[PDB]
Amino acid sequence: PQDLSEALKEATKEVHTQAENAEFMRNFQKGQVTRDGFKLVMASLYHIYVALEEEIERNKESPVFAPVYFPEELHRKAALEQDLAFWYGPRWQEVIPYTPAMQRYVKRLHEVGRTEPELLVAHAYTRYLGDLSGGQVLKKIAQKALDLPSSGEGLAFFTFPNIASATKFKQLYRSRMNSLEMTPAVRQRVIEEAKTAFLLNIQLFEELQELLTH
Ligand code: HEM
């Protein structure tokens, strides 16, 4: 359509369906991804979010990003730090894995942030809106289909606490995506970054399945 949000949802529809069928996300819902596998996901999110969120911070203030900047509602870095300390312990920072597929993903994020910040909005949409779309049904699959000790920790990533309703927030985020000012050339690229974004996730899933199978 002519609304960026709707353009994004339509384009990335097939790649998105590829992830629905990925071997890793099927076991990750069939409720049987090992505690090892879960921790690799969390570790993956951390590195990604750290990247996404440095570059968002670098580009906040810029017309290409300002309008979709909601730091309090969306930031995930602290939430993942809390979680990783529970999953990996007090020295999580030194022990967490950092694989080729995570770095791939993280590489693109710094590139876009540093040279094509006008595309950063493609990664925000894919990350935030999708994560917000699943942090609910997923968190259950997780916890119940996971452990945990009588913890009270380890699943904070799945709650955006400064967002009372995900629905009301998405709508406002899309709204704000739609008044993003953009050349038709840039817009086509942002669209194509949304696909690249999904692809980076897919390659990440395929890598984590490799590591978790032998
Ligand atoms: C088997 C794997 C997946 C399943 C089963 C799944 C499921 C869903 C479903 C049912 C929705 C509808 C939104 C809603 O519930 O209200 C959704 C939305 C969404 N998904 Fe996924 N998803 C998967 C993988 C992914 C991945 C890997 C990404 C990218 C990292 C992604 C990105 C998004 C985004 C950005 C939205 C909403 C954005 C918008 O409204 O335009 N999905 N997902």
Nearest residue (CA) to ligand 1, atom 1: 20
Contact indicator for 173, 8 with CB cutoff of 8 Å: no
Nearest residue (CA) to ligand 1, atom 18: 130
- Rounded Cα gap, residues 180 and 187, in angstroms: 10
Q: Which atom of ligand 1 is nearest to the CA of 5?
A: 41
Which two tokens mark 141?
């699959």
Q: What is the span of the domain harbouring residue 3?
A: 1-214
Nearest residue (CA) to ligand 1, atom 15: 133
Mutate to test the pocket of ligand 1, among 9, 16, 52 (most ligand atoms within 8 A of CB): 16
DSSP states of 79-142 as a string?
HHHHHHHHHH-TTHHHHS---HHHHHHHHHHHHHHHH-GGGHHHHHIIIIIHHHHHTTHHHHHH
3-state class (DSSP) for residue 76? coil
Q: Is the CB of 8 under 6 A from ligand 1?
A: yes
- What is the distance in angstroms between the CA of the first residue and the CA of the last residue of the chain? 45
Total number of domains constituting the chain: 1
Contact indicator for 120, 59 with CB cutoff of 8 Å: yes
- Rounded Cα gap, residues 87 and 103, in angstroms: 21
- Rounded Cα gap, residues 35 and 87, in angstroms: 9
Q: Is the CB of 201 under 6 A from ligand 1?
A: yes
Mutate to test the pocket of ligand 1, among 10, 20, 133 (most ligand atoms within 8 A of CB): 133
Contact indicator for 198, 14 with CB cutoff of 8 Å: no
Q: Is the CB of 130 under 6 A from ligand 1?
A: yes
How many other CB atoms are found less than 10 A from the CB of residue 205? 21
Contact indicator for 139, 214 with CB cutoff of 8 Å: no
Q: Give the resolution value in Å.
A: 2.2
Cβ burial 163-173 (10 Å sphere, 16+ → b, else e): beebeebbeeb
Method: X-ray
Q: Which CATH number fits the domain that encloses residue 17?
A: 1.20.910.10
Chain centre to alpha carbon of residue 214: 27
Q: Is the CB of 171 under 6 A from ligand 1?
A: no
Contact indicator for 190, 122 with CB cutoff of 8 Å: yes
3-state class (DSSP) for residue 56? helix
Crossing angle of helices 100-115 and 35-59, rounded to 10°: 10
